[PDB]
Amino acid sequence: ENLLSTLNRLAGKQMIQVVKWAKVLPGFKNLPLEDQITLIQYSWMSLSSFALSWRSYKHTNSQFMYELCQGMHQISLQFVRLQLTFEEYTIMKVLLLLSTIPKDGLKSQAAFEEMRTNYIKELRKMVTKSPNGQSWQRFYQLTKLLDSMHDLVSDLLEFCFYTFPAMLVEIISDQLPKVGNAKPLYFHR
Amino acid sequence: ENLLSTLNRLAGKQMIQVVKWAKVLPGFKNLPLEDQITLIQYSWMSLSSFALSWRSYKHTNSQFLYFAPDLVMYELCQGMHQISLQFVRLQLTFEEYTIMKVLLLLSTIPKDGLKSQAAFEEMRTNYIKELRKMVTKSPNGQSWQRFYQLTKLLDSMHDLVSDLLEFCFYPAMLVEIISDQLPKVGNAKPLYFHR
Ligand SMILES: Cc1c(C(=O)Nc2ccc(S(C)(=O)=O)cc2)cn(CCO)c1-c1ccccc1C(F)(F)F
Ligand SMILES: Cc1c(C(=O)Nc2ccc(S(C)(=O)=O)cc2)cn(CCO)c1-c1ccccc1C(F)(F)F
């Protein structure tokens, strides 16, 4: 009984710490607030898998739902193969945040597409400086890894839409709403 | 101890029922979501005063401030009771209430301006026009007169609550119901670098 509760409570501790991180990313809180929410929601499983596999690779050197956990452990091993930088994690994290959208599209697809492109360019630039042994190779791998991140979580998004709150919506809109200062509008001066 | 708790809990019951009402108003949920929130926030005391004074005039014919059927500070309540009496003077229609309510919702903004001042200014204008049209059909006893009164009444509604906005300032509930229908949660399209 106790196990599945704690992971849904750690999931919650982090989902609030993701918001705080995303809200410094350039041009995020400059998106529509509808979209901020949608983009964090849709990404979350891609985002978590990466983050978990990362802390595997960093903390216990890729040592520590076994159908489903096996994937993450497998990626954390890939991280050692690539000797992934932090830079490459934080960028690839952002990219995952922007890799899952609704088929409908977002409020401002135009704004979103610039942001994603902006970041995809950061990666491009960032691997004409940290490859191994040319740049184009490093790019092919980091990209294909981000893709396989979707495949890992491919069939487990419906199975989340169950577990998928009033918590985060508080912290996202928190800083953006702009609450003495009030200007009332009169019909006669 | 018990009194001031219940009014802050009736305030909360209504704050959620305002959201649901606003979200059918034409061109509201078409505003920025930042603005929906700001507009409901800033208006709330203008909005409540009108609504309370209205249920006075409708339910008990302007005798007691009918806070609810579950309930049939006097510096401040005196104002509302005073307005509810004005309502009888004008024999205010429901139409005139619901429109004037919307106008109050769009009558208080931050001096900074909203995310989409342009969008907001069209909305307000749109509704100010509804009034204008709506009192070239329900006056008494010419149209221009009825406008002067309903407008000056919406103004006095700001004066009534003039100094009590700080005292309100100085939640996670409504933010849930506003964004509720607007965010658009199987359907997911993941974006691949290689097909
Ligand atoms: C533990 C967990 C987490 C989690 O911790 N995620 C996380 C995301 C980002 C970061 S970051 C970028 O480094 O801040 C850190 C952590 C998300 N979920 C899914 C909940 O809907 C679960 C969960 C719940 C129930 C069963 C199974 C699992 C699990 F996903 F673990 F398999
Ligand atoms: C009761 C109340 C209400 C209230 O019920 N408002 C309301 C708004 C719209 C509608 S509608 C359009 O018809 O749905 C109905 C009702 C708002 N506040 C202010 C709270 O910040 C209080 C309150 C709390 C504490 C002390 C004093 C008061 C009071 F305002 F009453 F003086």
Swiss-Prot record, chain A:
Effect in UniProt of substituting S5Q: Strong decrease of transcription transactivation
Region: Important for coactivator binding, residue numbers: 20-23
Describe the location of the NR LBD domain by residue ranges.
Answer: 1-172
What are the binding positions for aldosterone in this chain? N8, Q14, R55, T163
Q: Which domain of life is it from?
A: Eukaryota
Q: How is it modified after translation?
A: Phosphorylated.
Task: State which disorder the record connects to this protein.
Answer: Pseudohypoaldosteronism 1, autosomal dominant: A salt wasting disease resulting from target organ unresponsiveness to mineralocorticoids. PHA1A is a mild form characterized by target organ defects confined to kidney. Patients may present with neonatal renal salt wasting with hyperkalaemic acidosis despite high aldosterone levels. These patients improve with age and usually become asymptomatic without treatment.
Could you tell me what this protein is called?
Mineralocorticoid receptor
Q: Which source organism?
A: Homo sapiens
* Gene behind this protein: NR3C2
Q: Which residues of the full protein are shown?
A: 763 to 983 of 984
From Swiss-Prot, chain B:
Effect in UniProt of substituting E34R: Decreased coactivator binding
Query: What disease is recorded for this protein?
Result: Pseudohypoaldosteronism 1, autosomal dominant: A salt wasting disease resulting from target organ unresponsiveness to mineralocorticoids. PHA1A is a mild form characterized by target organ defects confined to kidney. Patients may present with neonatal renal salt wasting with hyperkalaemic acidosis despite high aldosterone levels. These patients improve with age and usually become asymptomatic without treatment.
Q: What is the protein name given in its UniProt record?
A: Mineralocorticoid receptor
What does changing N8 to A/D/H/Q/S/T do?
A: Abolishes aldosterone binding and transcription transactivation
- Which family would the database say this protein is a member of? Belongs to the nuclear hormone receptor family. NR3 subfamily.
Cystines in this chain: none
Q: Covered residues of the complete protein?
A: 763 to 983 of 984
Q: What is known of its domains?
A: Composed of three domains: a modulating N-terminal domain, a DNA-binding domain and a C-terminal ligand-binding domain.
Positions annotated to bind aldosterone: N8, Q14, R55
- PTM entry text: Phosphorylated.
Residues in NR LBD domain copies? 1-178
Q: Where is this region: Important for coactivator binding?
A: 20-23
Function as written in the Swiss-Prot or TrEMBL entry: Receptor for both mineralocorticoids (MC) such as aldosterone and glucocorticoids (GC) such as corticosterone or cortisol. Binds to mineralocorticoid response elements (MRE) and transactivates target genes. The effect of MC is to increase ion and water transport and thus raise extracellular fluid volume and blood pressure and lower potassium levels.
**Quaternary assembly:** Heteromultimeric cytoplasmic complex with HSP90, HSP70, and FKBP4, in the absence of ligand. After ligand binding, it translocates to the nucleus and binds to DNA as a homodimer and as a heterodimer with NR3C1. May interact with HSD11B2 in the absence of ligand. Binds the coactivators NCOA1, NCOA2, TIF1 and NRIP1.
Residues that hold 21-hydroxyprogesterone according to the record: N8, Q14, R55
Q: What is the effect of changing C168S?
A: Abolishes steroid binding and transcription transactivation
> What happens after mutating K20E?
Decreased coactivator binding
Residues annotated for progesterone binding in this entry: N8, Q14, R55
So which tissues is this one expressed in? Ubiquitous. Highly expressed in distal tubules, convoluted tubules and cortical collecting duct in kidney, and in sweat glands. Detected at lower levels in cardiomyocytes, in epidermis and in colon enterocytes.
Compartmental location = Cytoplasm; Nucleus; Endoplasmic reticulum membrane
